Subunit: 148 residues, 3 copies
């Protein structure tokens, strides 16, 4: 039906939102991670599209896990629920976060109607969490703080 | 086969505030998501220069949206009340009263802030559709629906307010 | 009983231009919404500095999209014609002949304007899916789908044009 084409489109939309975030000033490390993720998302979309073709591996998941641990250990503990916003960069990261979750919903729907490896949903599951973390990093880097 | 440790929702499911689990493509999770996406777009608008009063209203709205999402997360919970709807209706009367009557149809755009407000407006209307869809398959309070109904209207109004504030005007349709 | 007055759309239903009403999650309302969201994203791109011709094309497109939303609101009515499709084809030829042959795959991004154009492109394809879905349940003129299909291609080309105009470059 529409499941595959919809999932591909949402991943594309997410990747485009990340492109907008990349047009902003960013810490060099954050920029490097986001740029690499764009390539990952391009490959992810290809896996969703072509039958019998896989591209996302444990290595991709491991790298995301590594970035999560890294950036989180670079931030103070969460003291309260956060509202999406702050420096423009942080706000955009939150938009990316929500679009990534939207793509995850579509990927989950796709896997329910067609055989699909688990890597794609596990990738965006981690990515959503990382974008949340990166938003906090960007507020920090802007000399500001998260919106509570 | 995978050597990577499993994370909470790696299996495509997630939990609700009452302890129940649902698949991530569930209508309720979709509505929660659209509300979150709307709140995030408002965060982008808040990152722009804005009149103090407009910033105050939008900031308060983010809190409302956080609670609305929380209500969608905890089935049977009620965080959105008449007070919330009354405040939106008040802001609507407040800003509309200071603007000239809407003449021709307008196109979404203008000053960057007004343009962003229009994006917020459309994402808000998208959230309204998913909230309406959730309510058609699950008993839900009407407040959430009524709240976003008013919010898209207010976002439209605030877009006009922002074009004026920038010293410009609304983009008119041919 | 709520102490707040009710709006006509508070019950979750809304009206169509033909006097009928449907629930807001109806396929037709979803398509109207996505076209509106796309037009709004184009509004954000129009707030960026742009080459004069690109601004003229995008501004005209906003009027087309408003018309398209109007056609979707009035079931059966026809507002978008081949004339609109032809203009898009014209712009596609014009801007493509303004760019070097694309050799490698492109990632969405670059100068802010180009990045926004790609966001517009993805939202446009989302509206196309909604319009296509509407056709699965109701008879629908072909112009609306043909228009957004062409527009998604045009937005891709305009993104490339904007990267060059901003002294930037496409992300390979
Ligand atoms: N893809 C999604 N779209 C919208 N809302 C979501 C999505 N995934 C989770 N949520 C909601 O957000 C809350 C927490 O998000 P989180 O991503 O931590 O959940 P999870 O994916 O189940 O856990 P984990 O990240 O540890 O795998 C949950 O209460 C859930 O209702
Ligand atoms: N959530 C939505 N998404 C997309 N289109 C909508 C939505 N709600 C209404 N529309 C369409 O847009 C037009 C005007 O929107 P409006 O919000 O004024 O309608 P309503 O919600 O029925 O009325 P009210 O706002 O007074 O309750 C209507 O003709 C309707 O077809
Ligand atoms: Mg998760
Ligand atoms: Mg309404």
């Amino acid at each position: 039906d529409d499941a595959r084409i919809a999932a591909i489109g949402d991943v594309d939309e997410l990747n485009s939102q990340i492109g907008v975030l990349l047009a902003e000033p960013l810490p060099d490390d954050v920029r490097a991670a986001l740029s690499a993720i764009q390539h990952d998302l391009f490959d992810l979309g290809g896996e969703l599209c072509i039958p019998g073709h896989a591209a996302i591996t444990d290595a991709h998941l491991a790298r995301l896990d590594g970035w999560l641990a890294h950036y989180n250990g670079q931030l103070p503990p969460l003291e309260e629920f956060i509202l999406p916003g702050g420096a423009r960069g942080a706000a955009l990261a939150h938009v990316c976060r929500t679009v990534c979750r939207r793509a995850e919903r579509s990927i989950v729907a796709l896997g329910a109607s067609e055989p699909l490896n688990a890597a794609p949903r596990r990738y965006v599951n981690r990515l959503s969490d990382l974008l949340f973390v990166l938003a906090r990093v960007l507020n920090r880097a802007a000399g500001g703080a998260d919106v509570l």
